[PDB]
Structures are given as structure tokens and as C-alpha cells.
């Protein structure tokens, strides 16, 4: 099929598209949300916790950004499990209180389902309709959901990459929430910003990809860090051992006797049915299931539903659980061959354990250390170096530059890439905005219509 060939030469130019999107978002003025004090205090009283004083700062910054005429653009870069989502949920309440149709965009179906459950739990006493669209929904109810949204009756639409496919038309969109943004890519992150120019993008992540971290530290997007630890979170213990069946058995038995559950990440669908069958012979005391995104929907959904209700302990999974599945009882992740994983992926996988008052371990099994590559050694000696609460920002500012921030005006978020400077970019943006203010050049996206 001629894979060898390098196709054409940039079938499209992204500098002009991204420049026009930025210069149209920075030209006009967004919605100025109206904040209700004693009608939002009830929604705060629905929260069965207390906001830590660094998260009750990100929330205050988010609301005081939404209540201004400018179009919001923020990062909520706090470490894993620190209550990032509730910031988005309080932002979503302020948006939906003014009938503004929040749109939540998550990069996987398990996040779609879990955020659907969490949002439906939280907004369980208000006239707010919350709905999920992804491949887990059928082909006959997806068109019903799209008809409802275009009609203007679903006020929160949680979805995967389906939310960008040009047939999802929102009536009056007033807030976007991109959750776990480091798995999307630039085209996915402005595919909705192009249509609705002045939408308020709230962007939740734990380890940003270098482009949107340099872009946040350089003053293009606002930043709100959340390192403040929750009630009793404990530092997740990192062990980097060579693979050993006794080590695997000991870890799984230590978790089973405690009553928790185990993530056992294999990350290979072709051999996952053999890895689980082999692990079920190594540890007969465990109950083991398989979960990945390449098996049929009514099977993965039911397996991941059984895992919540403690119907088995070990779940041999791919990196579909890299994205932020909570499951507070699971407190031991065992990554089978962790040499080929990024720093962001490794820290995200380490973040899936903890989430509660328990002490949670994390084993990153490796091959024999002369058989690993050199970058794997540098990545593992960095993931094992940082084992502290709030280490998800130092790790991000290490990944950035270790890999370097990519093209600020183009694609390729991570890489040296010989990008243009920020001084040139701000001058170019101001030039485009000033040329567009006078002779109001219609939006290029509408030209696509």
C-alpha cells in the first residue's frame, strides 16, 4: 500500500489556520457571565468535602475569569487526584446557570462514562440535563442526542473526539472544558475554538504537553497550579525492579489481603489474553478480567462496571486507564514493561493509585537494565526520583525542554522544531488582529461553509 513514501508536502498549512483562529478569538469579546451568590452557595453545599486552600484559589480564579468580558483561556495544571475536576464542575455550574451549554471533551470512552456518572451525581438536584455521546452510545441514540443538543435542551454534553466531527452543532455554546488535554493535539484543541470564536476554554490536565506548558508560562494562557494535597493523600511509593514473578505475586497478594484492587497494565491487546491467563496461574487467589478499548463496547463497559463493584481484584488493562479513571479502591498498579512509556504517561499511570486515605504502591517492572535503551533509563531514573505529592508540575517542567516546546504557531507540540520566538508571535498576532479589526475579514471557518 506504499507506506514507504512520505506522501506530499504539508497537505495543509497550519500557521495560517492557527494564526487566524487566535486572531479571531483575541479580536472580539466573549460572554460576561453573571454570577449568583446564594444560588451557587447551594451548589457548593452539595460538595461533601472542603476545598483545599489552593483549589479554592483555582476555583476563585476560574470564576473571576468567567465573570469578565474577555474570553477565558486557562490551564488548571495540578497534580493527579487533587480535585481538578470539581473546579471544572463549579465552572460548569456557573455556565449552565446562564443557559450556556457546557461541552466537556475527554480523550477516551472510559473518561466519558466516568465523567458522565460524576456530573450526573453532582447535578442531581437541579434542572440540568447531562448527556454523553461516544461510541458506547448506539447509532440511533447518537442522532437523538445530536438533535437534542442542536435543539438546545442538553445543557452538558460529555464526549470523546465525537465532539469535533462537524455534525455536533451546539445551539448556544458558552463553555468548553478540555479534560486531560495532553492526549489531543493542536487540531483537536482548536477544532471547536474555530467554530465558536469567543468560547471560554477551561483546560484541565496534570502533566501538560510541552507546547501548552511553555504557552502557559509565557503569558499566552492563564495558569492555576493545584499542588495542595487533599485530605489524606499519601505519596505513592515507586519501585523500579526488573521483572520477577515473585515480585508480581507478592504485590498482588499484598493488595488482595488488604482488600483493594490491582491494575496490571500490559499494553498489548494481541497478547493480553495470554498475559491474563498466565497471571491467573501465577496468582490463583486473584480474580482477573481483561479491559482494553479494542473489544466490543457492551463487553468493555460491563467489565469496567464490574470492576467498580468489586467483582474482581486484578484487571489486566491497556493504557486506556492512563487518562484519569478514579476507582478509589484500586491502590496498586503494576506496569509490566515500563521502559517504553513517556514521563507523562508514567506519571499518569502512577496517579491512578492513591485517591484515598490508603497507602498505594506502584511497580514499574523493567527488562534487564543492559537491555533497556538509554532514554528509558533516563526516564525511569526521573520517574523514580520524584515521588512526592505535587510532583506533577516539576515533572512537566522537566519533560518540557528535555523534549523542548514545539512550534508555537504550528503543530508538533513536543520537540525543538526551531519554532519562532514569542516576540515574533505577539507582533504577528497584533498585526493580524489590527488588520482584521478594520476591514472585518470574515472568519476563515465560515468561508469553509
Amino acid at each position: 500500500s506504499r507506506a514507504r513514501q512520505k506522501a506530499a508536502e504539508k497537505v495543509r498549512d497550519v500557521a495560517a489556520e492557527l494564526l487566524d483562529i487566535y486572531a479571531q478569538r483575541a479580536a472580539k469579546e466573549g460572554f460576561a457571565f453573571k454570577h449568583d451568590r446564594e444560588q451557587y452557595q447551594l451548589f457548593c453545599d452539595s460538595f461533601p468535602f472542603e476545598t483545599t486552600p489552593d483549589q479554592a484559589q483555582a476555583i476563585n480564579a476560574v470564576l473571576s475569569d468567567m465573570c469578565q468580558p474577555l474570553a477565558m483561556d486557562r490551564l488548571v495544571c495540578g497534580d493527579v487526584g487533587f480535585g481538578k475536576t470539581e473546579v471544572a464542575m463549579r465552572a460548569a455550574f456557573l455556565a449552565v446557570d446562564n443557559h450556556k451549554q457546557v461541552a466537556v471533551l475527554v480523550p477516551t470512552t472510559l473518561l466519558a462514562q466516568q465523567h458522565y456518572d460524576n456530573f450526573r451525581d453532582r447535578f442531581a438536584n437541579w434542572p440540568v440535563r447531562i448527556e454523553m455521546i461516544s461510541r458506547f452510545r448506539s447509532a440511533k441514540e447518537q442522532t437523538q442526542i445530536l438533535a437534542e443538543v442542536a435543539e438546545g435542551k442538553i445543557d452538558i454534553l460529555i464526549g470523546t473526539h465525537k465532539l469535533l466531527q462537524s455534525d455536533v452543532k451546539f445551539k448556544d455554546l458558552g463553555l468548553l472544558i478540555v479534560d486531560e488535554e495532553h492526549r489531543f493535539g493542536v487540531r483537536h484543541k482548536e477544532r471547536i475554538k474555530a467554530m465558536r470564536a469567543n468560547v471560554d476554554i477551561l483546560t484541565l490536565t496534570a502533566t501538560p504537553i510541552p507546547r501548552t506548558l511553555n504557552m502557559a508560562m509565557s503569558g499566552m494562557r492563564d495558569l492555576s497550579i493545584i499542588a495542595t494535597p487533599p485530605a489524606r493523600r499519601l505519596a505513592v511509593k515507586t519501585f523500579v525492579r526488573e521483572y520477577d514473578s515473585m515480585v508480581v505475586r507478592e504485590a498482588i497478594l499484598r493488595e488482595i489481603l488488604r482488600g483493594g484492587q490491582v491494575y496490571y497494565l500490559y499494553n498489548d491487546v494481541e497478547n493480553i489474553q495470554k498475559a491474563a491467563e498466565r497471571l491467573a496461574e501465577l496468582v490463583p487467589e486473584a480474580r482477573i478480567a481483561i479491559g482494553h478499548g479494542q473489544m466490543r463496547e457492551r463487553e468493555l463497559e460491563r467489565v469496567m462496571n464490574d470492576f467498580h463493584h468489586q467483582r474482581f481484584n486484578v484487571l489486566v488493562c491497556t493504557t486506556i486507564i492512563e487518562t484519569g479513571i478514579d476507582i478509589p479502591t484500586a491502590n496498586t498498579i503494576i506496569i509490566e514493561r515500563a521502559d517504553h512509556f513517556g514521563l507523562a504517561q508514567l506519571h499518569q499511570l502512577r496517579g491512578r493509585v492513591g485517591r484515598s486515605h490508603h497507602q498505594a504502591y506502584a511497580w514499574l517492572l523493567t527488562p534487564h537494565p543492559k537491555a533497556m535503551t538509554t532514554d528509558a533509563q533516563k526516564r525511569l531514573e526521573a520517574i523514580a526520583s520524584l515521588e512526592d505529592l505535587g510532583a506533577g508540575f516539576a515533572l512537566a517542567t522537566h519533560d518540557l525542554e528535555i523534549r523542548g516546546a514545539g512550534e508555537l504557531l504550528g503543530e508538533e507540540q513536543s520537540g525543538s522544531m526551531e519554532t519562532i520566538g514569542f516576540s515574533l508571535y505577539m507582533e504577528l498576532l497584533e498585526n493580524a488582529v489590527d488588520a482584521l479589526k478594520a476591514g472585518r475579514e470574515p472568519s476563515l471557518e465560515d468561508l469553509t461553509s
Binding site: 498489548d268 494481541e270 537491555a371
Partner: protein, 50 residues
């Protein structure tokens, strides 16, 4: 009776086997990766270590 001759063939064969260990490591890696039905014994084996 304590010292032994390593002539041309033995040393060359030992060096060939040393170079073949890296090759078998690479082949075992490619085999252990998934989706083997589209492969042939040329995509995994490289003649550069040998």
C-alpha cells in the same frame, strides 16, 4: 597441554555468535510485539549487527 589454539575459524565463529546475540534480542523483541500475521523473516532481522 594447558594452552589451546584459537585459529581463524574459531575466533570468527565466536565473533559471529557475539554479533548474533544482538540480532536474536531484536528478533525476540519484534516477535513479542503484537500482530504477527503480517510479518516475514526480513522485517525483524537486520544484517547490520552481524
Amino acid at each position: 597441554g594447558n594452552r589451546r589454539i584459537r585459529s581463524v575459524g574459531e575466533m570468527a565463529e565466536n565473533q559471529f555468535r557475539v554479533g548474533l546475540v544482538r540480532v536474536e534480542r531484536a528478533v525476540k523483541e519484534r516477535l513479542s510485539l503484537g500482530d504477527l500475521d503480517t510479518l516475514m523473516p526480513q522485517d525483524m532481522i537486520n544484517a547490520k549487527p552481524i
